[PDB]
Design a protein around this nucleic acid. Structure first.
Ligand SMILES: [Mg+2]
Lengths: 83, 287
DNA sequence: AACTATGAAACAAATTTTCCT
DNA sequence: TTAGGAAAATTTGTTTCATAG
């Protein structure tokens, strides 16, 4: 009910850099937006799309494949460029 | 009347008692979804059904033998929040069953009676699969669910002791794969010929499992307590057409041959890329 | 004039659910 | 029933265009 004053990248970066091992599966990043801001508890079709897009396009977000699927991580020296 | 949270560890035996597991469940078994008919009980490799039996109980009075689908991942044992044991009845069933429910885990109680020497023939246990979106989206549950489709038939019993002490015993089965697809594609290792040797190797180890193909490669690996892999060797595997579901691999040689303490290694099987078995246990001993 | 953060989509490949027989 | 098989859907990732600031 209030568009949080942060960019997706900023938040996607926060959810990750706050989890126990600094890495999250896509669904878990979703679970972070959802329980962190009431704004994300609606219109999922739209922001979920936005997150998947931010996660691929920005190089500071690297997908690390593993046995249990794949997790997302942030590369600080990179997130610290162009912003 | 008792109190043993399904998540609490329990040995398979204590005192003169032992909760055996005569026959074992077969490898594959496609759980059924609420939106579909039943898919029967868990059959055995033989063609029959699993079988569990007590031992140290020599008194004469039935006992309730519990049953719940447990988890089968690396971590300790715990109820598998995505799978529920499902009670089958009537026609093709010869085991009277009682159906409880603890927390969020469905439990199926079967009786073990002195008449059959405390030996029940689990032929009424089925497996129901819950949809993931409904289980992950639970206020507390932080468990995965995607590609999370292997289970273990967990058995538990409470022998009452004449001292006023409830003695709990429990034992899990071998992992079963409930996914239709992850049964046609993912190779699985049911039994391994040997579990160790000197840092030398060369010795052959036979693997018995499923979906083993002409491209089934095996790989040994090692990793620290944090998860960082520090070794990756591709053990040499063979090909035998007469031999149906087995694999013959040549234990590779450990990296540091100059070790004074035994180590822990893991090995799996890979048919393509996504098609990869679980990590199997193995140990290299000092020269 | 060129960017950026956002929206809205097209597509592909891996997986999960639902229907049929 | 129970067993098989597979169509339907969804999930997860990639890319394309467009527009407001
Ligand atoms: Mg990226």
């Amino acid at each position: 009910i209030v568009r949080p004053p942060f960019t997706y990248a900023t938040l996607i970066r926060q959810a990750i850099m706050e989890s126990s091992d600094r890495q999250l599966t896509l669904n878990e990043i979703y679970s972070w937006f959802t329980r962190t801001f009431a704004y994300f508890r609606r219109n999922a079709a739209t922001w979920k799309n936005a997150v998947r897009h931010n996660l691929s396009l920005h190089k500071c977000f690297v997908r690390v494949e593993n046995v249990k699927g794949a997790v997302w991580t942030v590369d600080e020296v990179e997130y610290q460029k162009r912003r | 009347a008792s109190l043993p949270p399904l998540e609490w560890p329990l040995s398979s035996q204590s005192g003169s008692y032992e909760l055996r597991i005569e026959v074992q469940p077969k490898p594959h078994h496609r759980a059924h979804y609420e939106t579909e008919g039943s898919r029967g009980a868990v059959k055995a490799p033989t063609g029959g059904h699993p079988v569990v039996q007590l031992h140290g109980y020599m008194e004469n009075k039935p006992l309730g033998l519990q049953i719940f689908i447990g988890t089968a991942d690396e971590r300790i044992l715990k109820p598998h929040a995505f799978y529920q044991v499902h009670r089958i009845t009537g026609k093709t069933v010869t085991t009277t069953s009682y159906e409880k429910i603890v927390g969020n885990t469905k439990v199926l109680e079967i009786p073990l009676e002195p008449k059959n020497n405390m030996r029940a023939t689990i032929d009424c246990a089925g497996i129901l699969k819950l949809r993931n979106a409904d289980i992950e989206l639970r206020k507390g549950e932080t468990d995965i669910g995607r590609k999370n489709t292997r289970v273990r038939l967990v058995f538990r019993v409470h022998i009452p002791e004449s001292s006023g002490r409830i003695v709990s015993l429990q034992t899990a089965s071998n992992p079963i794969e409930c996914s239709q697809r992850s049964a046609h594609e993912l190779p699985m290792v049911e039994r391994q010929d040997t579990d160790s040797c000197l840092v030398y190797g060369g010795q052959q180890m036979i693997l018995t499992g499923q979906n083993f193909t002409s491209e089934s490669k095996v790989v040994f690996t090692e990793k620290t307590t944090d998860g960082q892999q520090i070794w990756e060797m591709e053990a040499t595997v063979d090909k035998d057409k007469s031999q149906p579901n087995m694999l013959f691999v040549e234990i590779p040689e450990y990296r540091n041959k100059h070790i004074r303490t035994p180590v822990k290694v893991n090995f799996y099987v890979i048919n393509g890329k996504r098609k990869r078995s679980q990590p199997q246990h193995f140990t290299y001993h000092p020269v």
